[PDB]
Enzyme design. Sequence first.
Site, PDB file in Angstrom:
ATOM      1  N   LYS A   1       0.823  -1.244   0.000  1.00  0.00           N
ATOM      2  CA  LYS A   1       0.000   0.000   0.000  1.00  0.00           C
ATOM      3  C   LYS A   1       0.851   1.287   0.000  1.00  0.00           C
ATOM      4  O   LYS A   1       0.751   2.154  -0.919  1.00  0.00           O
ATOM      5  CB  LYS A   1      -0.926  -0.040   1.121  1.00  0.00           C
ATOM      6  CG  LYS A   1      -2.314  -0.838   0.446  1.00  0.00           C
ATOM      7  CD  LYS A   1      -3.159  -1.127   1.629  1.00  0.00           C
ATOM      8  CE  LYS A   1      -4.509  -1.659   1.266  1.00  0.00           C
ATOM      9  NZ  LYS A   1      -4.480  -3.116   1.049  1.00  0.00           N
TER      10      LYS A   1
ATOM     11  N   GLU B   1     -10.705   6.198   1.812  1.00  0.00           N
ATOM     12  CA  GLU B   1     -11.778   5.269   2.168  1.00  0.00           C
ATOM     13  C   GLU B   1     -11.143   3.943   2.562  1.00  0.00           C
ATOM     14  O   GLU B   1     -10.055   3.635   2.038  1.00  0.00           O
ATOM     15  CB  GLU B   1     -12.708   5.059   0.937  1.00  0.00           C
ATOM     16  CG  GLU B   1     -12.289   4.129  -0.257  1.00  0.00           C
ATOM     17  CD  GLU B   1     -10.960   4.376  -0.995  1.00  0.00           C
ATOM     18  OE1 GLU B   1     -10.430   5.487  -0.947  1.00  0.00           O
ATOM     19  OE2 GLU B   1     -10.435   3.453  -1.633  1.00  0.00           O
TER      20      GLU B   1
ATOM     21  N   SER C   1       2.539  -9.777  -0.626  1.00  0.00           N
ATOM     22  CA  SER C   1       2.208  -8.363  -0.573  1.00  0.00           C
ATOM     23  C   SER C   1       2.031  -7.696   0.789  1.00  0.00           C
ATOM     24  O   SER C   1       1.993  -6.459   0.860  1.00  0.00           O
ATOM     25  CB  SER C   1       0.984  -8.241  -1.464  1.00  0.00           C
ATOM     26  OG  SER C   1      -0.068  -8.998  -0.890  1.00  0.00           O
TER      27      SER C   1
HETATM   28  C1  LIG Z   1      -4.111  -3.697  -0.101  1.00  0.00           C
HETATM   29  C2  LIG Z   1      -3.706  -5.245  -0.004  1.00  0.00           C
HETATM   30  C3  LIG Z   1      -4.068  -6.182  -1.026  1.00  0.00           C
HETATM   31  C4  LIG Z   1      -5.263  -6.058  -1.915  1.00  0.00           C
HETATM   32  O1  LIG Z   1      -5.269  -5.031  -2.830  1.00  0.00           O
HETATM   33  P1  LIG Z   1      -4.701  -4.787  -4.200  1.00  0.00           P
HETATM   34  O2  LIG Z   1      -5.151  -3.430  -4.536  1.00  0.00           O
HETATM   35  O3  LIG Z   1      -5.368  -5.861  -5.089  1.00  0.00           O
HETATM   36  O4  LIG Z   1      -3.276  -4.899  -4.412  1.00  0.00           O
HETATM   37  C5  LIG Z   1      -3.400  -7.461  -1.013  1.00  0.00           C
HETATM   38  N1  LIG Z   1      -2.502  -7.799  -0.016  1.00  0.00           N
HETATM   39  C6  LIG Z   1      -2.115  -6.984   1.018  1.00  0.00           C
HETATM   40  C7  LIG Z   1      -1.244  -7.626   2.069  1.00  0.00           C
HETATM   41  C8  LIG Z   1      -2.699  -5.649   1.061  1.00  0.00           C
HETATM   42  O5  LIG Z   1      -2.350  -4.792   2.048  1.00  0.00           O
END
Ligand SMILES: *Cc1c(COP(=O)(O)O)cnc(C)c1O
Lengths: 389, 389, 256, 256
Positions: B85, B107, B375
């Site tokens: 993020k 949001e 992620s």
């Molecule tokens: C924000 C988030 C996502 C989901 O969102 P995307 O916009 O699809 O990238 C996925 N994994 C983590 C750990 C996140 O913080």
Amino acid sequence: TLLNPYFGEFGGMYVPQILMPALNQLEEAFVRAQKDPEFQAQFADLLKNYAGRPTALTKCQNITAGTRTTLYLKREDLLHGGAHKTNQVLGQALLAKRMGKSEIIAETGAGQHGVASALASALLGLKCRIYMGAKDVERQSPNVFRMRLMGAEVIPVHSGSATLKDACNEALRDWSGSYETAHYMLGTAAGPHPYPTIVREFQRMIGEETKAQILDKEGRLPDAVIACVGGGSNAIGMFADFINDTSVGLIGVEPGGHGIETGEHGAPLKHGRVGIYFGMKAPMMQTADGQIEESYSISAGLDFPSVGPQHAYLNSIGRADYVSITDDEALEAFKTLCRHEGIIPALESSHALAHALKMMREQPEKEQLLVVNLSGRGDKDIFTVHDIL
Amino acid sequence: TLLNPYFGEFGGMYVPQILMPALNQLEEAFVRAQKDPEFQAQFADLLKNYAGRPTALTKCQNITAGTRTTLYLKREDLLHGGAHKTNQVLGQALLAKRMGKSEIIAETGAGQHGVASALASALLGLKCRIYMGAKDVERQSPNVFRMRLMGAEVIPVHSGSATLKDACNEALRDWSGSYETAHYMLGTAAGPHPYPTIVREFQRMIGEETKAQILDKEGRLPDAVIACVGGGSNAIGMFADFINDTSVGLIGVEPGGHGIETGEHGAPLKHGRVGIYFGMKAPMMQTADGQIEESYSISAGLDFPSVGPQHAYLNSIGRADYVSITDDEALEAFKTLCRHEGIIPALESSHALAHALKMMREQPEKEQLLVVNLSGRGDKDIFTVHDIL
Amino acid sequence: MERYENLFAQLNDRREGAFVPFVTLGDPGIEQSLKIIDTLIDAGADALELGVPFSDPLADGPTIQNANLRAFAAGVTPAQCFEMLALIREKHPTIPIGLLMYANLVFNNGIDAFYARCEQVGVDSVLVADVPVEESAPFRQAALRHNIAPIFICPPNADDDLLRQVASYGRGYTYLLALPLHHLIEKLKEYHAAPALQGFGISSPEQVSAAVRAGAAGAISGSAIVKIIEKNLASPKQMLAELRSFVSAMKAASRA
Amino acid sequence: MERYENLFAQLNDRREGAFVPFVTLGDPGIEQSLKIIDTLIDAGADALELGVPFSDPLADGPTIQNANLRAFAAGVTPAQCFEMLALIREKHPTIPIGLLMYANLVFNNGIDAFYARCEQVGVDSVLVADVPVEESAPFRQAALRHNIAPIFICPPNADDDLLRQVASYGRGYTYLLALPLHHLIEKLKEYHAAPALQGFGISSPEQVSAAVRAGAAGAISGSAIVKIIEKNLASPKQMLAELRSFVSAMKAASRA
Ligand SMILES: *Cc1c(COP(=O)(O)O)cnc(C)c1O
Ligand SMILES: *Cc1c(COP(=O)(O)O)cnc(C)c1O
Ligand SMILES: [K+]
Ligand SMILES: [K+]
């Protein structure tokens, strides 16, 4: 021993005779590992590619507004696991392996050392049992769930007081029998030699990195590197490379707790007396009758009732200066770093930050380059901080 | 517009007329920021020294045992904030600043975007208000406490369903009036142009870093880079630099939820129909009567009921392939990475891991180099995972 | 398309501005809404602007949001919406009826097919709240082909290019929402836009008279009608009475 | 220092091994402990090994841990420990009394001052559980200067160098805990160590006889005495009776 067990008068090997060959096997292994290029290379490789090193040196832009202080934070909160614990836990597991061991034994209070042993064990294929006091298990069940998820066995100590001092003991008792197959992964730069020396060398990359980064960014060395002291590994990890740089001050911050004057504190190096316990001759929290007692602090990660021998020595010769910070000064510095730089610090590292803020606020026209060691992130502390406010 | 708003037929700017000058001010600012070396330098500097980039590419040693698959993890869990993020939130705040704005509107659902806006705001001195649905506030109060600690105002949406779709709306309504002083920091590579394009360029360093690191380590490109898709930023951040490398596969993993067949899933790109909502023409979760409905998944961070236009386009032309993974396949992959490499993944990223494990297990003698995009870290999920087991 | 021209012809002979109430279809019940719409027309509404319920309003927030909810619960399906629209037209052959929509509900079963069912039920115009003139070509061409006037919002932040596009593309009336009103209305007249109706915050008879005087061909009263409906939800005969006197006041004031 | 030599002289004339019970001082009460120690001596204990309560035992775990706790609660301060030690010596002038300590409690008020109060109350030896022979010089020299025999543990993992140091430095007796026992005992004799007493797991009369036969000058029975004490804690007269018969059995078996 191949290495000196003492730091002045502090240190030693005050263990049962039966553990003495285990400690001398360990020191031989370490000295040998130190001379081995491929040991080093293997250790560097995991710190880079697994753990996340070099960590960053963040210049604080907003908190020093309207004073003449530049403040840099060494970002150990960005290390895998969210605390500097990880550096040394990877090097001791590489060492357990180099000695043909297949188990790891460890002890904990607030589970961060437990979680770091569990994670290095799971990565390197060692079996791992963690001794943690039942009082601590009841209080630290997020960390317990997390240790179990990494495949580690959590054994609840119930020895009288069922806190870390009882955990440390039971862990040594187990290693008395297991030392041929198991390695004891001691949590801080304390206990019998060679653990003071080993834990330091496996944390010294924090200081070596800070020196190189500060010279890149500022073209000169800091005026002080500040770091909290539970048992002392992050602090000695930060100070070690600076010890010969007489110009650089080294300040260690112990938990003043509710206030030194109240007795409810965790500051043995400056307000406890020397004793022999946990396998070392070092200052500690004890009654007038030599019974050891518990350290108190807002951060559960600063509750070791004694401190590493090399700190007590560095204090004696006047090379480092040690101070305390109250629970409340730590809460305010927690809140301040959140609100002004968007970094939630660990309540343990908030003690070191709070001191650097005090230095700043009290002499706002004093020109000074400080580096605080941000040793962990404060996500675990948000629940604690939330009953306090 | 200076830039194409469409990705094939997907995209657009389907907003009220009153917001159209705000979007064209934003696109002009962005194109200009892109040509400005000192914008770039300022953005690079914060990503390195504050956020913690380059993140590491960890080769998994133990999970691929006894198959012919090499698996690397791109370590976005080691980013400041504990999720990818942060990359784009720093670049959009630098941009709000370059446009003279002084507020940020955002949001959230599970507070991770909220927490990342709060932290970039606190760092760069912008005021920040976060719209989050009351259902989400009640459920995500650790993240709420954390947003407030960084000085952000959390406003509970109560519009009917009081979830993210209602939050997104109310946030756009507010920006209709505030766009001269405030910037809307949109959370994923979705909504009206130029947000699909902006959020991608501010996440593409994930893919650019993976390409450079994989060639260093393996001397060749992967066979597939796998990444989950809530709304799509991490996924398009990973894929973007690889899109011209026809050799590299790109697989996006949507939440299959309780199972596609049950209806309780969050997989619109492959099992929803195109509609026009949230300011874009893209596939979405809707009834036969065009009313939009909620995505379901074990991870609250994958509950956006639609997907970025560039993904739906990349699927159409057959350039990327999109798959789903059940809640249960994600729980098992969570547990497996903990137990075998001592990395607790986010339940969102567990969906992408679970697919790479499936590929491996089903064809164990297939020689393949995969890169999963890890992620986020799973510390927030340990409580969830703990009622499940 | 036509009834508007006819209404604007009739009003211009009478030196009078148009008064148009807004109400959501099906709120607070189907029968109830049909009685409300009949009392609004009976009390002097010149045209009607009808909202359909959607996932959620954007271009309109609080009061309208609450109103859609009441209609969702009332079981107003798209089927019930066109059934209601056909009967309103069967009782009132002349009233211009315009619809306020969102783009998903138009697009759902085909754009052109939405406009064909509109033409079949006797709707005169459609305003699609979230299609800027930059995205309107498919909706425009489809409306024109089915003799539905495409209504566009002319916002406070309008610039000249926008003004020229809204005058080139709209039909029926312009929905009027930097720039003095007096200057906006003049430029629309110059560009030969459809008759501007002032839609922002018309809640007092004083305000309808102000709009007409300014050169706006009349006033749309949005939320105010919905407010009486909310205010009196369990008092229905006097909800209707309040509505009647309010529309009579509003309408009297447009005779200027 | 002396009473040991005298005891080993007396036993060697009698072709008998030494039986030494271990008990923690103050457990389960002060009066109670003083009665226990009198019944142990009365029942045939040759010497006494007394544990003081500390923060926690290391060299001994479970049973002893529980026993220290009972004594802590009993209000056994270091002051009460030496007061108890002086009366035990006043009633029993000949019994060798040895103390099992931890290094902190020795060091607390000065090493040399601990050994002076020991000499003043008539203690004969001190075993400091956590001082390896590598760290013993200060404790050794201080004990010697106050005629207290420094007892050292000779562990299973002993190697030759350790064996030579334990024989050069210990006095009173060697506490015996790779290498056959038979080989350990021979090397100690060769090096001229103080009389080895076998301390590991002596719980049956069979075991005392085995030890003596092996060449160990006698056996220390650790936890077994504590076990009877725990087992009968609210039955005190028969706790004492069980103790008496147990020590008589153990002691009879050392006549070999
Ligand atoms: C924000 C988030 C996502 C989901 O969102 P995307 O916009 O699809 O990238 C996925 N994994 C983590 C750990 C996140 O913080
Ligand atoms: C382990 C820990 C400490 C306390 O221990 P030291 O051994 O003194 O370094 C401090 N901060 C954090 C965040 C920790 O995890
Ligand atoms: K301490
Ligand atoms: K989605």
